[PDB]
Design a binder for this molecule. Structure first.
Ligand SMILES: O=c1[nH]c2ccccc2n2cccc12
Length: 117
């Protein structure tokens, strides 16, 4: 029902990797904190008019370095960011733009779409 809905889509996707190698309730906590941090980060950086404006800011990147929002959601969930990294596909990008959520795996991977309207 917003940028909200789209952060949900990305969240669901990301944590989907984490369940069943990381403890259930603490992955739930990881999601909830992730959701909060994205909202807090994306506030005022969301322009349905120019969806691509700030797209590179909003991008969740987990290459050889981890996006702070990921690192923060880990610390606030008691999870070792190395164990979280480990269960997430390497060189992952998730772009969350108005009307579209998409992601790439691997430097030469195709972009895939989770949500578009
Ligand atoms: O890995 C990146 N993907 C990306 C996708 C769309 C827009 C901007 C970016 N971007 C900006 C710094 C880094 C990245």
């Amino acid at each position: 029902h917003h940028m909200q809905l789209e952060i949900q889509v990305a969240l669901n996707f990301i944590i989907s990797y984490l369940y069943n190698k990381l403890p259930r309730r603490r992955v739930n906590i990881f999601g909830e904190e992730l959701e909060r941090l994205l909202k807090k980060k994306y506030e005022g950086h969301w322009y349905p008019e120019k969806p691509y404006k700030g797209s590179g800011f909003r991008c969740i990147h987990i290459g050889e370095k981890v996006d702070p929002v990921i690192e923060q959601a880990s610390k606030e969930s008691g999870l070792d960011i190395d164990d979280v990294r480990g269960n997430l596909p390497q060189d992952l990008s998730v772009w969350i733009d108005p009307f579209e959520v998409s992601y790439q795996i691997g430097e030469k991977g195709p972009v895939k779409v989770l949500y578009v309207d």
